[PDB]
Design a protein around this ligand. Structure first.
Ligand SMILES: Nc1ncnc2c1ncn2[C@@H]1O[C@H](COP(=O)(O)OP(=O)(O)OP(=O)(O)O)[C@@H](O)[C@H]1O
Ligand SMILES: Nc1ncnc2c1ncn2[C@@H]1O[C@H](COP(=O)(O)OP(=O)(O)OP(=O)(O)O)[C@@H](O)[C@H]1O
Ligand SMILES: Nc1ncnc2c1ncn2[C@@H]1O[C@H](COP(=O)(O)OP(=O)(O)OP(=O)(O)O)[C@@H](O)[C@H]1O
Ligand SMILES: Nc1ncnc2c1ncn2[C@@H]1O[C@H](COP(=O)(O)OP(=O)(O)OP(=O)(O)O)[C@@H](O)[C@H]1O
Ligand SMILES: [Mg+2]
Ligand SMILES: [Mg+2]
Ligand SMILES: [Mg+2]
Ligand code: NA
Ligand code: NA
Ligand code: NA
Ligand code: NA
Lengths: 462, 461, 458, 458
């Protein structure tokens, strides 16, 4: 009963996935030796669950994923390779660790000719933008891992692939590392394709950026654990506010656009959520109000976590073509205010406080563990691209680093499994509809009556 | 010379302040000895000399708070009550906890009562929810934000409230909260006198803004600044990540800009700092932004919540609700950058409102110590029959100050002070030739880099 | 980046599928109130038509079960925490209690004080009853509210206690020692025909448990360690020929040391037990560091350098303090070379207790709760003699005998350790040409800088 | 009745202090206008009245620090120098950064020079490593502990140092450091006078201990208290986890106990607080511990590093090295509990020395603000030719104070003050009948629980 689930992507490139789809494209040939390693691809089962010990276990699936690793032979000539980095889309903890590690691995391990950082996402690759490219060196990236955001900066909206490749050519780029999400990596493919049309010796390698941890073929993306730490700190605040008011409601919106991993993890980690609203589990304003009522039958406080992709069906694009969400944080808060107002009887006093800790989550520096994670991804990213990997992203599954072709990855998305342990834990700690309000509380205060008497004895026995 | 300034309160009770006004009311007589210690000392309101020994430029003296040899209430028979009212602020639980423990540990009082949800917990209805505070209850509450007692907005009937105080045997009510709260305390105190009730009403001032008069520091304030700065770094991260990126973050200052200002300087990251003391027009702000965007691709704008209330068009307690200047300013800045898509090709505005995260978060270690000291001294003085007053801190000393005085004046930024002078230094300036200013910038830079270039050549071999 | 190795006191010399099978109290007649056969996962997902594991081993997946062995409303759960302290003990304690009380509505939960001592005839008088009100907020605190202890107790006394108190499940939270004790307790309870599950929640801040990629507390330890490293780094940078030496937890392995070294980006030398080197080699690395820098940060795991010189109540071998010894050797070295290093300072940081006695990261908390929750599920379903663990992002059940027979260790050929090699001083570099190719990288950079800024004026 | 007290310094330069002593030396003349501001004000040393307007109980006035209309140095031609000496303390980089920026932004000075590794950077040899500080260099340093300039211990030749100041064109040297540092400053200032050099020597006081006279707060101090408290929680966690567990944590206080005391109260967790102001014997400490162990299974002992120096038997600068009381106290406590295995069956002592983590960690937001203000004012006054003095803060105001006065007295805990009175409250007390004290404890408890029991029945 695992806690994630796969699902077709809103804009899938493949409708089915086969082993060939999973094979990673490589620039032709690998003639130089690896200074790092002063001999062939290893794989890992996509799914380690067996069919049919006995004679050796056979996977319930035919799929293998390529393991990322440093390689004996590499494709590019180390001391002559130029590496490029761009960061696109929203910001997320660990961008600067990615930037820094790519640079240092290039410079320290492979002793590359130069590292170029492109400004403000793909815009920095445009004819106009290219004038702002900077050269990244040890001194530039030494301390950037202490800061949120991206020193390169980022942007939204497309650029002309022909301009971008023009730029890559003019500057002598051999590897462009594209750090960003779904949009970014789709752009990567376009760039990669245009370079091919030209017969340019260029790897385009993706480092996946999604604070939501909704990437397919992945159990963890950088930034995500940090977002959970911060979200929990948001939740404590909301909890403080609710407890301080008779019929107090703390509503806090968390990141989840298409999935509720942050919302769920934070709900359980904090032990403080009473209602947890995720996109996987669309419910009506009436149900929410109903859960709130139940909560207010036995408590004077209620914390409601809501993922930003929840309740999009509750009412009525950006430069990149992404569908703008309606702010469910604001809308839900208003509906809850409405509800408690229309019931001034039952709830004499009552307060609703709303917290949107969005930017503080995304624009804050990485946890130590996220840093380590970023550095590992980035390091391996450089290893594989040096060995001519292209058209793929690096990811992590089953505690292993793998290579995955952009087409596969952008075709499916990870989603909460409502039958999973994580979501089962959210159901445990939150208010429940399916409980006789009466007997439920009756079996509460009795659990209490017991406890206090055990208490009373123990202390007399003093 | 100060970074603060005094100003008449929006609803002042005194129009002038005299020594007699500063005298603290005391329940008649002090017959019991102080178990803790098994006449009143003063401090000059103003330590600046006029014109042999220096003479204050002012006649005012303030009474120093301290544990007293003789006390008014009979320790082992006194009942203490605590209520928290108004908004929440870091340190409420440390206050609650310290009052309780000082009462219980030092004076060995009969009982401590905590009243729920502000003054509502003193109403006939509310009183049913009063709880008894004991060591076990308050042991660990200092680790949490908010108030375990809870708080509320809106008035109660002083006759009901005193009824409650009488029925429960309360000898001291500690009222923890703001201007409103302390005004309510006077009412309560007055009604208790009309009845000849032996009751002290003592205020522990609660203002996250640090805008209390006769005070240089109120609990929660330093914690607010730590948190604000953290908010500012986020806004700065967002701005730096975007070509012509603007991070707008709203901070607490309702009638004053101390938090805004301190956080601006502490962070080193603010480009524009908007406070109520210094009302400027949308056009001026846009103008400062333009100047910032002449030499930088990023701008962080701090705005206090009481700024720009004159830029456009009540709560249960009668407080005037503010228009959200964070939201309005953000929109105006969006409007401005949109209407200038030419000059600024790309451009982004991100708004952060860290309000509840600041107010509902636990105290720094230093705030905790501060809370405990205030609360401790509060118990000392009220045991010694002080009433109608608050405890406060001036010139590194704890003083007693009558509610009437304190609610008549408020502390405000002095724009001629060092703090504000530092805000002027670090932020964009209007009165600089945009051109020659940047010219003398990149030249400072050209220098630097060449010093750099030499140093590193002087490195090889 | 890990590797398996025989345990210092192994119970099995080889591991077979049958060894991996988890013992279950006979029969499962009651329904699970929570859910108003066993699934497995390959021990090794590398392949040798559908892929075939390079290994025959399967591990049992932990999960809530349709049928359970104990009668929920009549089961009594007990908890004990033993050995050293580690971040997340209270989360474990709290989650076991709440899962028992909320999900299974068990009769009662008992907390035993000060490790196994609380199960002794004497100790048992101090047992307390855990209820929602008791555990509500303990996850905010380091340490263990139950307390812990070192040293054995009489298994007959302990089982006496379990019987007298009506315990149906004892959760033993702790390390290798603890779980070995658990088997003893479990065995004695069988000799008596007692209906008792003894289930282990593994506690090792080192992350050196076999059949496991992550144990609770570990990620928190790394956060804290990195904070220690920054301090050391601050101290080194503030002194001409400054050395910051900071000791980290690793007794038999170097996972914390290594992860913290890379996470911080600040370690110049990283000393782990997997890679024993001589005082002379360390001094040599330091010299190379001091050829191109005025600062050096040295991370050393506590199990390093035990061979550099000459027991506790539980029988554990006490280590010599390598932190103190190494610091002294480094002082000696820099003193004996006052010539080359005019000034020079050594500051030593031992952040040990601050690491172990501090509250869990949010992620660790989630992790603790999940482990504890599943632990309750499986023990309700009569699992015993085993621990819960996590491999390949999955929770599994593993018999104490297997787990205590092997240990996880750094693989020096792995990515983690390869990253430590990258960021740290290297022996095998021509000191000269290495620095020559340094300042040249620099000369370049500055000139790029100098142009960019000239191209700035006007 | 305050919480500090004054005391003669171990190496006082004045035996009495008069108003003339308090007057701040100024380089002759002030002819240039202040670009910032496009006579001296004072404050009473003591605001308590004697006996119409109140008269100070003291004749002393202190000069208020402020930006001045006229300044002494020609702004666009002044060269500023910065050195940091002595131990490290949170806020050094904020000081460095603010001096630089105030110089560069406000006064538009010619150049800012940072000297490396304390006074050594001013020696003939050291001077070769001087670096030029500019906006780009100091932009982000406030995020780091330590000092980018670095520091050192041990004297240099004043003639060399002034040679350096002259050769480089320094008009103001800002000396950031302690007592030793500022004494060095006077020497440097004196030698420059002998030469008729136009040089201000201005001190920014550095003492993490908050024991500076004429001062209520020095930078770093509040940050130290935050960190110390965090150390204390760890020790508390360790003590609570062990039957008769003792957490001993050593804090910074060399000659005073402000950090120890503040941290003891702030944490609410200390049972015993040992400061230098209150020397007690091993027997008394052991005795307080016994009392603690009469009603509790845990004890946290805070000890300041200058405590217990009389309990047993120099550095490059001539400072007296302390015996490690942390280590010695821990041992004595171990001895004591060992020799009483009877009364305390089990028992553990865990010792935490969070020293470097406190000193080498970045400033709280409030400390940063403080550092920047001090530094800013420092630059204002030195531009207006103040010299031979330090900037300090008393009664929420910034004042100028001559090094001679400041190095002659030191701030010390007042055992009759509120702070120390609070330490007495929260800690174990000797002067309580062990028996009736606990009797009146559990009775307070018996009450409480019954109030509890009713409430919950209701
Ligand atoms: N299908 C596509 N083809 C070419 N370019 C694209 C495509 N989709 C997105 N891009 C470009 O890639 C960049 C980033 O895309 P987008 O704004 O969707 O961010 P993302 O990488 O999906 O991250 P996030 O999930 O934070 O939005 C933008 O320049 C966008 O215009
Ligand atoms: N003048 C007054 N007389 C009697 N009661 C008052 C008065 N002003 C306010 N109160 C009551 O005291 C309580 C607190 O008032 P208010 O909500 O203004 O808090 P405050 O102390 O101003 O703190 P904050 O700064 O958070 O607003 C409310 O219940 C309010 O109705
Ligand atoms: N082989 C064994 N048989 C029975 N009991 C044991 C055995 N080994 C250890 N124990 C007991 O289990 C308890 C905990 O053991 P120990 O102190 O070694 O902790 P641990 O689980 O190893 O944790 P840590 O990793 O902190 O050492 C002790 O009381 C010890 O006496
Ligand atoms: N009396 C003195 N005359 C001249 N120089 C001195 C004197 N005392 C100390 N110094 C020098 O000043 C520098 C710092 O002095 P010291 O090491 O005593 O630290 P400090 O400033 O008192 O700081 P801390 O409080 O951290 O010890 C050293 O170079 C030292 O040699
Ligand atoms: Mg997208
Ligand atoms: Mg062991
Ligand atoms: Mg000294
Ligand atoms: Na409540
Ligand atoms: Na300005
Ligand atoms: Na150094
Ligand atoms: Na190495």
């Amino acid at each position: 009963r695992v806690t994630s689930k796969l699902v077709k992507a809103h804009r899938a490139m493949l409708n089915s996935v086969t082993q060939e789809d999973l094979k990673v494209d490589r620039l032709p040939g690998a003639d130089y030796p690896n200074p790092s390693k002063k001999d062939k691809t290893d794989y890992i089962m996509y799914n380690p669950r067996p069919r049919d010990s006995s004679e050796n276990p056979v996977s319930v699936s035919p799929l293998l994923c390529e393991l990322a690793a440093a390689r004996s032979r590499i494709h590019f000539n180390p001391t002559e390779t130029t590496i490029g980095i761009v960061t696109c889309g929203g910001i997320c903890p660990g961008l600067n660790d990615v930037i820094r590690s790519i640079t240092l691995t290039g410079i320290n391990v492979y002793n590359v000719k130069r590292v170029i950082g492109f400004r403000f996402g793909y815009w920095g690759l445009s004819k106009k933008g290219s004038q702002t490219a900077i050269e990244l060196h040890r001194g530039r990236v030494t301390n950037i891992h202490h800061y949120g955001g991206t020193i390169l900066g980022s942007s939204r909206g497309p650029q002309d692939p022909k301009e971008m490749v023009d730029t890559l050519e003019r500057l002598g780029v051999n590897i462009l590392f594209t750090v960003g999400g779904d949009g970014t990596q789709r752009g990567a493919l376009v760039i990669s394709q245009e370079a091919k049309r030209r017969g340019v010796d260029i790897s385009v390698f993706g480092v996946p950026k999604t604070i939501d941890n909704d990437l397919s073929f992945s159990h963890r993306t950088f930034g995500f654990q940090t977002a959970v730490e911060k979200a929990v700190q948001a939740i404590r605040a909301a909890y403080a506010e609710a407890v301080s008011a008779n019929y107090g409601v703390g509503v806090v919106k968390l990141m989840g656009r298409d999935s509720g991993f942050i919302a769920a993890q934070a709900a359980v980690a904090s032990a403080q959520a009473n209602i947890c609203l995720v996109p996987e589990n669309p419910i009506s304003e009436q149900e929410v109000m109903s859960l709130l009522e139940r909560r207010f039958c036995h408590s004077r406080s209620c914390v409601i976590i809501v993922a930003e992709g929840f309740g999009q069906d509750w009412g009525r694009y950006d430069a990149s073509g992404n569908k703008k969400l309606i702010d469910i944080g604001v809308i839900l808060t208003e509906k809850v205010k409405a509800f408690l107002k229309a019931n001034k009887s039952r709830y004499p006093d009552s307060t609703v406080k709303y917290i949107d800790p969005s930017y503080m989550i995304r624009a804050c520096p990485p946890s130590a563990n996220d840093a380590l994670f970023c550095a590992t991804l980035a390091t391996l990213a450089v290893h594989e691209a040096m060995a001519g990997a292209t058209g793929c992203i690096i990811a992590m599954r089953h505690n292993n680093y793998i290579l995955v072709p952009i087409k596969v990855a952008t075709s499916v998305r990870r989603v909460l499994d409502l039958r999973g342990q994580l979501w089962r834990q959210v159901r445990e700690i939150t208010v429940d509809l399916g409980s006789d309000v009466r007997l439920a509380r009756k079996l509460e205060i009795r659990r209490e009556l017991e406890a206090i008497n055990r208490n009373r004895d123990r202390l007399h026995e003093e």
